[PDB]
């Protein structure tokens, strides 16, 4: 159920079949222009998971705090790191990772072998403003926006970092610290 492929790929071996191009047009020039761009994008990132998150209300420098931690890590490790960081940007990175993995599964890739191979940011459209200063001077008041792109590939070169895991606090009927026998410590 993949979108049609309209040309040969750049791979050493071909894995799909090229289909004939459509012969019908869209009613309006605006619709035709938009759809041509969509067709061009559908020729890319085949056999890999990709995501593109638009208009995140953050800046490039704020996003790079989290992204620099996950590059070249296995998907399982990268996902865990994004959860523990107490930053507003870490929430958006986590959503992108989940969206990309869902994309990979639809293409038929094994989630247990995915590696974060490419991550970068891109500039969005800015909201301009002004703020007054002393003695009649004025300054800038800008709200920034950014795009995030994540690419997941199978059996790509990965870092060896691995995190230790411990269980949380045991609360409820599963905690049995009250059954400890303290009579032993009085002996020699």
């Amino acid at each position: 159920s993949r979108p049609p492929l309209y040309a040969r790929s750049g791979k050493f071996r071909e894995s799909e079949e090229v289909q004939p191009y459509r012969t019908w047009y869209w009613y309006d020039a605006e619709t035709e222009s938009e759809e041509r761009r969509k067709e061009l994008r559908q020729q890319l990132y085949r056999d890999s998971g990709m995501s593109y998150y638009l208009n995140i209300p953050q800046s490039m420098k704020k996003l790079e705090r989290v992204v620099r931690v996950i590059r070249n890590l296995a998907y399982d490790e990268a996902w865990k790191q994004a959860c523990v960081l107490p930053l507003k940007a870490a929430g958006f990175v986590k959503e992108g990772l989940e969206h990309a993995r869902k994309d990979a599964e639809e293409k038929g890739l094994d989630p247990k072998k995915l590696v974060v191979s490419t991550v970068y940011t891109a500039k969005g459209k800015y909201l301009r403003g002004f703020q007054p200063m002393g003695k009649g001077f004025a300054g800038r008041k800008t709200t920034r926006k950014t795009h995030l792109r994540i690419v997941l590939r199978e059996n790509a070169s990965v870092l060896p970092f691995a995190a230790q895991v411990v269980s949380p606090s045991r609360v409820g009927g599963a905690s049995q610290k009250h059954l400890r026998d303290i009579s032993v410590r009085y002996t020699v």
Partner: peptide
């Protein structure tokens, strides 16, 4: 806290448009 009633519609539209979303 004192937004105009004559531009309520346009504020709503801008709020919807200016949300993060995934491309296609």
């Amino acid at each position: 806290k004192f937004q105009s009633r004559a531009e309520k519609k346009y504020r709503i539209m801008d709020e919807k448009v200016g949300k993060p979303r995934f491309q296609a």
